[PDB]
Amino acid sequence: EWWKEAVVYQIYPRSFYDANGDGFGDLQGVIQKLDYIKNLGADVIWLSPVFDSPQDDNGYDISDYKNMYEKFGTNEDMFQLIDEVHKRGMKIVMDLVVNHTSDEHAWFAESRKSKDNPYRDYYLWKDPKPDGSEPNNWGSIFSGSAWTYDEGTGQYYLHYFSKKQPDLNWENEAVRREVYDVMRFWMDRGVDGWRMDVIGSISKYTDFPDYETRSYIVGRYHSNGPRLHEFIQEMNREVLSHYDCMTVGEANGSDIEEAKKYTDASRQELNMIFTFEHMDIDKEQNSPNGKWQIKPFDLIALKKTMTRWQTGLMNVGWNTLYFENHDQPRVISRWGNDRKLRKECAKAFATVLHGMKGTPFIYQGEEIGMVNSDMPLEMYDDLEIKNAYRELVVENKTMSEKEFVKAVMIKGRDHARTPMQWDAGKHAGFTAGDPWIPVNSRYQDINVKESLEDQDSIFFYYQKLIQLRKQYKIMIYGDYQLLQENDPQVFSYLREYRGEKLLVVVNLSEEKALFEAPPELIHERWKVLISNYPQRADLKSISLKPYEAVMGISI
Numbered sequence: 001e002w003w004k005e006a007v008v009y010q011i012y013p014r015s016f017y018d019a020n021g022d023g024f025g026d027l028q029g030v031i032q033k034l035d036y037i038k039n040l041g042a043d044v045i046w047l048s049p050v051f052d053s054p055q056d057d058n059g060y061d062i063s064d065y066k067n068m069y070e071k072f073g074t075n076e077d078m079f080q081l082i083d084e085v086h087k088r089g090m091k092i093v094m095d096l097v098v099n100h101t102s103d104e105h106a107w108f109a110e111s112r113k114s115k116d117n118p119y120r121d122y123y124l125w126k127d128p129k130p131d132g133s134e135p136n137n138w139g140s141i142f143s144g145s146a147w148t149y150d151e152g153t154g155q156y157y158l159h160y161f162s163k164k165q166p167d168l169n170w171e172n173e174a175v176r177r178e179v180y181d182v183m184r185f186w187m188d189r190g191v192d193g194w195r196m197d198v199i200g201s202i203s204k205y206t207d208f209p210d211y212e213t214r215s216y217i218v219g220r221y222h223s224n225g226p227r228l229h230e231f232i233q234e235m236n237r238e239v240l241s242h243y244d245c246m247t248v249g250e251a252n253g254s255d256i257e258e259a260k261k262y263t264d265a266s267r268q269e270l271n272m273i274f275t276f277e278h279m280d281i282d283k284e285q286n287s288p289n290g291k292w293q294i295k296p297f298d299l300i301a302l303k304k305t306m307t308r309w310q311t312g313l314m315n316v317g318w319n320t321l322y323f324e325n326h327d328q329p330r331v332i333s334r335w336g337n338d339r340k341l342r343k344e345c346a347k348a349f350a351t352v353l354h355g356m357k358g359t360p361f362i363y364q365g366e367e368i369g370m371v372n373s374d375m376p377l378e379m380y381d382d383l384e385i386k387n388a389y390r391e392l393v394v395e396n397k398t399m400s401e402k403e404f405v406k407a408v409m410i411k412g413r414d415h416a417r418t419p420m421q422w423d424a425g426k427h428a429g430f431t432a433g434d435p436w437i438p439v440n441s442r443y444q445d446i447n448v449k450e451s452l453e454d455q456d457s458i459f460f461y462y463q464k465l466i467q468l469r470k471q472y473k474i475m476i477y478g479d480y481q482l483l484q485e486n487d488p489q490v491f492s493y494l495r496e497y498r499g500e501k502l503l504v505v506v507n508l509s510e511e512k513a514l515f516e517a518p519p520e521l522i523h524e525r526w527k528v529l530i531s532n533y534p535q536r537a538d539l540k541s542i543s544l545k546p547y548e549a550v551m552g553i554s555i
């Protein structure tokens, strides 16, 4: 159960470090930066997908599960990355993307040829409706229909995501055996675990029922299918149980109840899952514009959501802790202050997250306070944006252009994909060539070199938070309790374990705030473990400065 005590660093390798000088982040670049990650303190790295792919969705549309995409390097580089990680006492978690493949996968190239092709059923084909339209009104997460017509066989194929990401048919035993062969291949060669991409979708309602009704709908059939957990349970039986490993599911559509199904140790499925519920706090529940129909940051909602998850898996299953990844913007730009108070705010949000129960995940650049980009709309790369622009702005007109741009500047996935900022030199030292996407214009004041020089840096604050987690077992095994829950500025909570208490008090606003400990904690004595300002250790009453974070342990 080393995975309970781990801190995971997520690398998006095409934007981490270009060792070879082609403007593209590569595996040798990752190897060169292992020392830096270890120095931060993470003991597990999860690497976004580096398998062969036409890059329609930047790695998540795989055309070969057993070879690297050329621009990352070869398999000899990957096996070397694996050995270099293990050498440093670290673990490596690869991204398992098996809800769908690339339409350029060998399997799909055969499958599309005819109905009588051996691979036809590796994927999900349906006849049109009598009037020629799609088998149902299901939409793609990336806009338009979830169904694409093949003139050659007169049938549609299913894709929850891009037209170039046909969904696999998990009902087919051949397809599952194929996936397990892929997992076995890599785990035999030292991969310590998997992050499972949209694992919540692998089971379909095989009757493909319409939604009630404007034109295409994404909803409850797109996840949590009737055989989801059956399949995962088989995966565990056939594979995960043969190795000392770690598993984290990207559980799209997951609520607390579903989380227990995934994570309850007794069910022998997965160790932990990512949820979206705390990420969904700043969108309207059901608008045709989805994630792009944005709501202001609501602290109460954040507290309510995260707390439900802390208490829900408090004594059963296990939580993941994250605010950033390659699918999310920079949390400080999204929900806080990324200018004058950038460091305080980054530290605030870190403290809130790291003081909780579960496994923390640090997204590359989170640890130095990277921010959202001011790049123009035409400079974004993500297919999700271009597709949404076309649907929401051009065709349906459910968002003005100005409104669509505001939304992308807050929530566009590309805010997480501009290259990692290493120093203040050309392309922030990411590359000696021309980067695949431009570096954020603020890199000169926000980078690793300046961070490692400044003792007041966000980097050292993260380093210290990781150190404290290894030193104080209460941070890993304590329970959780929300305090002052109605406070519109302060997020405070308590952890308790074996007679010891850990009090976390974080002001997530730009104004002064007042924390007053509940009556029953008034006569506790505290040792301050960390704070983003200079700090008596007298915590019965704290006048909190803008974005001030305090973590204290009872003595």
Ligand SMILES: O=C[C@H](O)[C@@H](O)[C@H](O)[C@H](O)CO
Pocket (backbone or CB within 6 Å): 057, 060, 141, 161, 197, 198, 327, 384
């Ligand atoms: O909007 C977020 C994305 O839909 C993401 O969660 C998918 O996992 C990705 O495209 C890989 O398939």
